[PDB]
């Protein structure tokens, strides 16, 4: 043995593994298996959770009356707030499942692993001699899970205010968010949708331009795809014909001819936009909300002349006034 | 004036719960992923064709060799995600498909909201909620948010209806 | 309400938990309502009401001082809630009180900066590692590393 | 619970039928000589 540990480190780090278990992986693989395994069981069999700390259990698992669309893993109790609630902090599991213990076990392990997943997206690139930065693209979607699963709760004072782990539970997170922060009227969210809309847009642009300017090498009755062999030397499409068409659609200088500048833009746009969206949720986590133009335009006498901004406020009040029916005892919603 | 269109659809059509709107977002959201992911995969999987750091100039506007290691990219993802492309022709067609299919679905969902044929409720859920007062899902919760949106908005949002909802009729939780 | 003749100690709220005072998970007496999440708050103005078991029902019942009543009122009406255009309050509020807590400004600005810097870290660290080993400008067309490794397929 | 009676068969055939389709092809492709 060249030296066990010496060997171990050579395996772990080996670039010949079907799946690259890296150094970051040694933390990832376990945390992610716990998060996943606990979730699946929760989502299927966990019992009702007193999410709002008011002894009014919300059941969100399949076996307790939910379907895929409604079902979810409910957030830890509000009675718990930001306190750490590891299983060994409960008189029993029965108590742990009631206060939404599974939620923390999941969010913490997931966020932990999903980070290492980033750390790994670097490591492998290193062991392979390729430039880094891919992991930096993945920093955006991660920075969101973080914002939605941890920053917002830290900011708001409780994990019970973090986004639930389920379809409908998410719509809840959204609808309420809007009511308390008026996010649609916040610069950061808008940049977010520009990035997402734009992304999908560009994703379609590139996708089509390229696919449409492929060099013919296939039969009339043969998948146009076969015209490409894994491990080719030259390109499979006429990037000069592509640019030729697109330059004429709009106008030449408003079209890419440099595949490298094209692809940088292609990555830069969504990642930058989502970065802002993530900073939006992380920012409105400290109550710096969207623009409040309520009763701005008023007439010559003082009467209030409504704008669409006001019609938006009514819809928001409906949400405010109805969410968490029994959780409030006082006038102002400061939590 | 578009944000209220959104809020409206939630409140009245409970649009977020619609299978077609979901596909819609899966496509736009998933499309904005391919976009970002493919872009980065290319920029960090490039061959060196220049001596500079700013590798942008190092590009051959006139085809020839692939400007990035398609072979390396394949191995990367094949080891970090488990699955990875290996046919630029397909990888690019996929990129057309995902977001165009998504938007098509989101359309059908709306073509149905025209007739108000929405995906508002789950009957099995409503029936259990009626008989049993302790049954609560994140779904029932939402529907109440809708009631509030409709009741508090309808008045100044549908002027032609000369709505008058006495303070006592307005749904509201405790304190708020 | 205590001045209106209500017995805070035994008041039962909608849920049956305690309109004004309730207990935390470890037994201490705290304020009730959604405010149950902030039972870790300590502050000059509020401490003199705390006992060895948390808020003391006797002090709360006759030791509350005016300077505290107005402190609580001041701070209540100056919570850190506001809009980008500086309109203090909840998103559904009306224009009039132009205010956004310094604590909100500071906290957000610095989370953004703190964040982007973590990206900055990743970016400059990723560059340094490729720069060192030496490939931060591309894969050697000739010696393409991946090409010397066995197929996992 | 109080679900739809045909829901089960609607979901079953919705999965089986097209899956059975693909599978018939893949296997007949897969077994084509040379």
């Amino acid at each position: 043995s060249a030296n066990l540990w010496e060997r171990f480190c050579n395996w772990v780090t080996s670039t010949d593994n079907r799946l690259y278990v890296g150094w970051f992986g040694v933390i990832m693989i376990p945390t992610l298996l716990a998060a996943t395994i606990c979730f699946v069981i929760a989502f299927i069999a966990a019992p009702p959770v007193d999410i709002d700390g008011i002894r009014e259990p919300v059941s969100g698992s399949l076996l307790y009356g939910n379907n895929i669309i409604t079902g979810a893993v409910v957030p830890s109790s509000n009675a718990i707030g930001l306190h750490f609630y590891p299983i060994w902090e409960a008189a029993s599991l029965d108590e742990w499942l009631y206060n939404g213990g599974p939620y923390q076990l999941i969010i913490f392990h997931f966020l932990l692993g999903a980070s290492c997943y980033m750390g790994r997206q670097w490591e492998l690139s290193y062991r392979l001699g390729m430039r880094p930065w891919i992991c930096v693209a993945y920093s955006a979607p991660l920075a969101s899970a973080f914002a939605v699963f941890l920053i917002y709760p830290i900011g708001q004072g409780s994990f019970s205010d973090g986004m639930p782990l389920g379809i409908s539970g998410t719509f809840n997170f959204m609808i309420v968010f809007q009511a308390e922060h008026n996010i649609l009227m916040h610069p950061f969210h808008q940049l977010g949708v520009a990035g997402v809309f734009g992304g999908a847009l560009f994703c379609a642009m590139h996708g089509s331009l390229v696919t449409s300017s492929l060099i013919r090498e296939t039969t009339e009755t043969e998948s146009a795809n076969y015209g490409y062999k894994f491990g080719q030397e030259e390109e499979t499409y006429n990037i000069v014909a592509a640019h030729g068409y697109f330059g004429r659609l709009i106008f030449q200088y408003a079209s890419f001819n440099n595949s490298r500048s094209l692809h940088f833009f292609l990555a830069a746009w969504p990642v930058v936009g989502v970065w802002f969206t993530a900073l939006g949720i992380s920012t409105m986590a400290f109550n710096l909300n969207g623009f409040n133009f309520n009763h701005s335009v008023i007439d010559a006498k003082g009467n209030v002349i409504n704008t669409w901004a006001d019609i938006i406020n009514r819809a928001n009040l409906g949400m405010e006034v109805m969410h968490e029916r029994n959780a409030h005892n006082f006038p102002l919603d400061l939590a | 004036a578009i944000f209220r269109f959104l809020l409206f659809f939630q409140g009245f059509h409970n649009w977020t719960l619609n299978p077609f709107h979901m596909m819609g977002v899966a496509g736009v959201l998933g499309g904005a992923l391919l976009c970002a992911i493919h872009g980065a995969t290319v920029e960090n999987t490039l061959f060196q064709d220049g001596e500079g750091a700013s590798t942008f100039r190092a590009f051959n506007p006139t085809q020839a060799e692939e400007t990035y290691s398609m072979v390396t990219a394949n191995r990367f993802w094949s080891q970090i995600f488990g699955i990875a492309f290996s046919n630029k022709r397909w990888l690019h067609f996929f990129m057309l498909f995902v977001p165009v299919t998504g938007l098509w679905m989101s359309a059908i969902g709306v073509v149905g909201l025209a007739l108000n044929l929405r995906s508002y409720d789950f009957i099995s859920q409503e029936i259990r909620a009626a008989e049993d007062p302790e049954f609560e899902t994140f779904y029932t919760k939402n529907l109440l948010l809708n009631e509030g949106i409709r009741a508090w908005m309808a008045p100044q949002d549908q002027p032609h209806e000369n709505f008058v909802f006495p303070e006592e009729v307005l749904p509201r939780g405790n304190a708020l | 309400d205590q001045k209106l003749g209500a017995n805070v100690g035994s008041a039962q709220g909608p849920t049956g938990l305690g309109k004004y005072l309730m207990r935390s998970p470890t037994g201490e007496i705290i304020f009730g309502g959604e405010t149950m999440r902030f039972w870790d708050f300590r502050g000059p103005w509020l401490e003199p009401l705390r006992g060895p078991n948390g808020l003391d029902l006797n002090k709360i019942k006759n030791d509350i001082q005016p300077w505290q009543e107005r402190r609580a009122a001041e701070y209540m009406t100056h919570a850190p809630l506001g809009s980008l255009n500086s309109v203090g309050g909840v998103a559904t509020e009306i224009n009039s009180v132009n205010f956004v807590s310094p604590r909100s400004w500071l906290a957000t600005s610095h989370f953004v900066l703190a964040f982007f810097f973590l990206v900055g870290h990743l970016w400059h660290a990723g560059r340094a590692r490729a720069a060192a080993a030496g490939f931060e400008k591309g894969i050697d067309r000739e010696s393409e590393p991946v090409l010397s490794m066995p197929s996992l397929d | 619970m109080e679900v739809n009676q045909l829901g089960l068969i609607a979901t079953a055939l919705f999965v089986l039928v097209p899956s059975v389709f693909l599978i018939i092809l893949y296997v007949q492709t897969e077994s084509q000589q040379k």
């Binding site: 079907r18 399949l62 062999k229 | 394949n74 094949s78 699955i83 990875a84 | 397929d153 | 679900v3 979901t11």
Partner: peptide, 30 residues
Amino acid sequence: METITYVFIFACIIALFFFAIFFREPPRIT
């Protein structure tokens, strides 16, 4: 009955995952 149907499909997608990652067509060069 519904629970079973939901879990089954899920279990089927995970099975797919496995086969897709470990039983793909080895990706051949040139």
